[PDB]
Ligand binder design. Structure first.
Ligand code: GSH
Ligand code: GSH
Lengths: 214, 216
């Protein structure tokens, strides 16, 4: 009901999927043993890392020998295993299903379209079709938020926590999403919800590190 | 523990995500009332469809007023709500977590790389791009590794993760990809087909794959 040892997270501070897990752990009041894994120095490619995770990604979680990757899988695991109740990720099938669709939306649509837009910019202009696709995803998110304070209902869930990382990022990059009225208010709302749980320490700090490339 | 009337699925027979849902429903012994949704004709773009699903995607599920989209969320919902047991998606946090990683692998890695390789070929008449193939092949190597010492993707028993992943393997088989040298995938594929044959594997997955293959 609590881990026997600190849960290990192989991570980097600016990594968006790492930041999602880290904030989720803070809300759960789990103290993670953060292990800096420099993917630029091949630290994810040693015989040891590959044995743990042959897909060689961060974040990778190690909970008393149980290995897990995929940030959204880690988020839901931490709640299922160590939540004081199920508030962040309710067991009620229909409530859970809405959250799961939002998580699939995050991975398959929003985050992917975010990557396609900002990868060429942060590193090496905004391709028009990529800008169009990301804007389209924001429109959908805005609609998801109509009639509700959080993305999947009345309460903040793991879905809000991973989606907000992307919004923190584009905000730090100078992307203006205020015309999406629901997103604009949900963003302020969620920032305040996460304030006592390391939002500045984790998410803002991480976003500023990615922004330094601009 | 059963839906009060048949669950509705807005779909098209060849659609990979629709096929994953349809086979999941068969294994759980739920009848779906299938509603053909013609993307070409903009049947997913009516004010009515958009009200139901603003993302205007298929599959879209209507369980007696409850609307859901995203194939993998639909799959897990059907087990959470209507499974006679949780064998397809166990409640044990560790076993559930592994399945969730495989589902995220399927969406964010395998299926995406499948789309990037095959979509230009099938629907734009563009040539096979070895760069995009390399990415897909890399993911097949990972899947082969996931199957080292397990009969199924998440462990000892078949799960929703096997069902959605098998759609992709069915498609590439129909397209003429020979993956027999990925021995774990090869054996797993024969195993999972056998598991799914009493649950409409031919009528759903094989039929769907051949329809996509006619574009080649
Ligand atoms: N969908 C994965 C994404 C993980 C991912 O692609 N992480 C990047 C860093 S942001 C990485 O480890 N790249 C190095 C590699 O894949 O070899 C998740 O949410 O955890
Ligand atoms: N990630 C979604 C994929 C849904 C999807 O992109 N479906 C396609 C058909 S294969 C579609 O509805 N395209 C038409 C559109 O989005 O407007 C899932 O797993 O359900």
């Amino acid at each position: 009901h609590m881990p026997v040892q600190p849960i290990k997270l192989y991570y980097l501070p600016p990594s968006p999927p790492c930041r999602a897990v880290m904030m989720t752990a803070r809300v759960l009041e789990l103290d993670l043993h953060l292990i800096t894994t420099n993917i630029m120095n091949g630290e994810h490619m040693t015989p040891e890392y590959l044995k743990m995770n042959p897909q060689h990604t961060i974040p990778t979680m190690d909970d008393n020998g149980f290995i897990l990757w995929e940030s959204r899988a880690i988020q839901t695991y931490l709640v299922n295993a160590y939540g004081k109740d199920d508030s962040l990720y309710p067991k009620n099938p229909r409530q859970r299903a809405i959250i799961d669709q939002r998580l699939n939306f995050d991975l398959g649509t929003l985050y992917l379209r975010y990557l396609n837009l900002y990868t060429p910019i942060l590193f090496r202009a905004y391709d028009q079709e990529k800008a169009d696709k990301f804007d389209e995803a924001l429109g959908w998110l805005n609609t998801f938020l109509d009639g509700r304070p959080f993305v999947a209902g009345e309460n903040m869930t793991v879905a809000d926590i991973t989606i907000v990382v992307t919004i923190t990022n584009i905000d730090a990059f100078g992307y203006d999403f205020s015309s999406h009225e629901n997103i604009a208010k949900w963003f302020e709302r969620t920032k305040k919800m996460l304030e006592p749980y390391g939002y500045d320490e984790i998410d803002v700090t991480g976003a500023k590190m990615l922004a330094s490339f601009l």
